Amino acid sequence: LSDKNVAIIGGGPVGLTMAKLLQQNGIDVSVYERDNDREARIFGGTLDLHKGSGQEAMKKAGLLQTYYDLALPMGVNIADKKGNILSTKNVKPENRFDNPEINRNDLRAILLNSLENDTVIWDRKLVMLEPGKKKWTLTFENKPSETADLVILANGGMSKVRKFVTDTEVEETGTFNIQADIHQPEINCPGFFQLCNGNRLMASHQGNLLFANPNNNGALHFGISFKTPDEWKTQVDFQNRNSVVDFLLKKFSDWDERYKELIHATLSFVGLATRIFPLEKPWKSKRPLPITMIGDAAHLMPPFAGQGVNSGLVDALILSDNLADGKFNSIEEAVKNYEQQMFIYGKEAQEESTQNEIEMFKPDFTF
Ligand SMILES: Cc1cc2nc3c(=O)[nH]c(=O)nc-3n(C[C@H](O)[C@H](O)[C@H](O)COP(=O)(O)OP(=O)(O)OC[C@H]3O[C@@H](n4cnc5c(N)ncnc54)[C@H](O)[C@@H]3O)c2cc1C
Numbered sequence: 001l002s003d004k005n006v007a008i009i010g011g012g013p014v015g016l017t018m019a020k021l022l023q024q025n026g027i028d029v030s031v032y033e034r035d036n037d038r039e040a041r042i043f044g045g046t047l048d049l050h051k052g053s054g055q056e057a058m059k060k061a062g063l064l065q066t067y068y069d070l071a072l073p074m075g076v077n078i079a080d081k082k083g084n085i086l087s088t089k090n091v092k093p094e095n096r097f098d099n100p101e102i103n104r105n106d107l108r109a110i111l112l113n114s115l116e117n118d119t120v121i122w123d124r125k126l127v128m129l130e131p132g133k134k135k136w137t138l139t140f141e142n143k144p145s146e147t148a149d150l151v152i153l154a155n156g157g158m159s160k161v162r163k164f165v166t167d168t169e170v171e172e173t174g175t176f177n178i179q180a181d182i183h184q185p186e187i188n189c190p191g192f193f194q195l196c197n198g199n200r201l202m203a204s205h206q207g208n209l210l211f212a213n214p215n216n217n218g219a220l221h222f223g224i225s226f227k228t229p230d231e232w233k234t235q236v237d238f239q240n241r242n243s244v245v246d247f248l249l250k251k252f253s254d255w256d257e258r259y260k261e262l263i264h265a266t267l268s269f270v271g272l273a274t275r276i277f278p279l280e281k282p283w284k285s286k287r288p289l290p291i292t293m294i295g296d297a298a299h300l301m302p303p304f305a306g307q308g309v310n311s312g313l314v315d316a317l318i319l320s321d322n323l324a325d326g327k328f329n330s331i332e333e334a335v336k337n338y339e340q341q342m343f344i345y346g347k348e349a350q351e352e353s354t355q356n357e358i359e360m361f362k363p364d365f366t367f
């Protein structure tokens with residue numbers, strides 16, 4: 001049911017997957033991505049696609065083998081502030097396929113490559129949405145505007161164009177995350193690198209959490225998290241390396257030298273407040289033209305349970321099915337139904353992520 005065309009805003013994992021599953025069923029899709037070009041480097045850790053959810057989307061796109069090829073199984077160590085390993089869960093073969101970590105750039109290369117040529121239009125930053133006659137008018141910063149019968153919002157948890165769908169707002173969660181990458185970790189943070197010993201790593205002490213992957217395409221990526229300091233309105237300047245170091249070395253004074261060394265080796269930090277785009281009230285049932293939201297734009301949730309890209313990939317799977325299989329009379333019904341399902345499991349996921357994030361950051365939290 002499409003002698004029409006679809007517009008996905010944002011070429012994240014979710015949006016790009018969405019375009020694949022539609023373009024597979026003959027649907028006319030374009031992806032408008034903010035990024036200047038495909039070789040833009042995506043900051044952040046590795047994604048694990050679970051079987052049942054994320055992996056199903058890759059399977060349906062016929063990319064699951066590709067995902068496996070590029071991915072990487074990881075063990076995980078739990079450590080204390082002193083450097084003791086408290087637990088080593090290595091990977092058992094056949095578990096190797098349960099949730100191998102993939103690099104975010106690697107993943108995009110897999111998705112992009114799956115799409116037909118010029119499916120993604122780069123250097124397109126969506127600023128404005130206007131529901132014209134029977135089409136949406138899409139307005140792009142310093143670029144030609146465009147039109148589409150259906151707009152799929154897949155532009156992340158901070159999307160500024162959710163208005164025609166819902167007026168719910170992003171909330172700050174209470175915790176705050178500081179993330180960084182270290183290159184040549186074996187050289188620049190040899191102590192910490194060896195404590196990881198090839199596995200992910202997660203220590204926890206007095207409401208300050210640490211997480212770390214020692215091998216994201218040969219970059220150590222770590223993240224520290226904590227309940228937001230009250231004195232923050234974020235009253236620390238993440239542009240000043242030394243500002244952040246000092247704040248961290250204070251938070252981490254009790255910890256072994258190994259961790260201080262990590263903080264010391266970091267060239268630049270990224271500050272981030274945990275946010276949720278809560279699935280409370282239903283979305284607007286009164287919409288000028290066909291429009292919906294998948295991925296982080298639809299159910300942004302704390303990054304403490306490995307959901308998000310999965311839920312998002314599922315969003316894609318469901319919506320894409322619904323918009324094609326023929327089992328529907330109107331696009332409005334097909335989106336309504338995807339939104340029906342997604343609300344149940346999205347909320348389920350948020351519940352976990354919220355709960356887990358409440359679980360840690362307690363006075364005495366065991367990993
Ligand atoms: C620190 C941290 C750790 C995390 N760890 C995990 C994890 O381990 N596992 C997991 O599943 N999830 C994790 N998440 C959440 C997860 O990474 C996201 O759910 C996932 O990236 C969602 O993909 P998406 O396409 O919906 O969102 P995004 O990746 O946010 O999609 C953004 C895309 O849309 C584009 N875009 C943005 N704005 C515009 C615009 N105005 N116009 C056009 N294009 C635009 C962006 O350029 C980008 O390409 C984590 C999040 C954080 C912050």
Ligand SMILES: CN(C)c1ccc(O)c2c1C[C@H]1C[C@H]3[C@H](N(C)C)C(O)=C(C(N)=O)C(=O)[C@@]3(O)C(O)=C1C2=O
Nearest residue numbers: 045177211212213221222223224225303304305306356
């Ligand atoms: C232990 N905790 C319950 C879980 C459970 C399941 C998961 O699938 C995951 C976690 C920890 C979280 C920690 C977060 C951390 N932070 C809260 C964002 C974080 O910074 C990192 C990191 N490597 O820096 C993660 O691994 C992380 O993104 C992550 O992917 C996790 C993750 O994959």
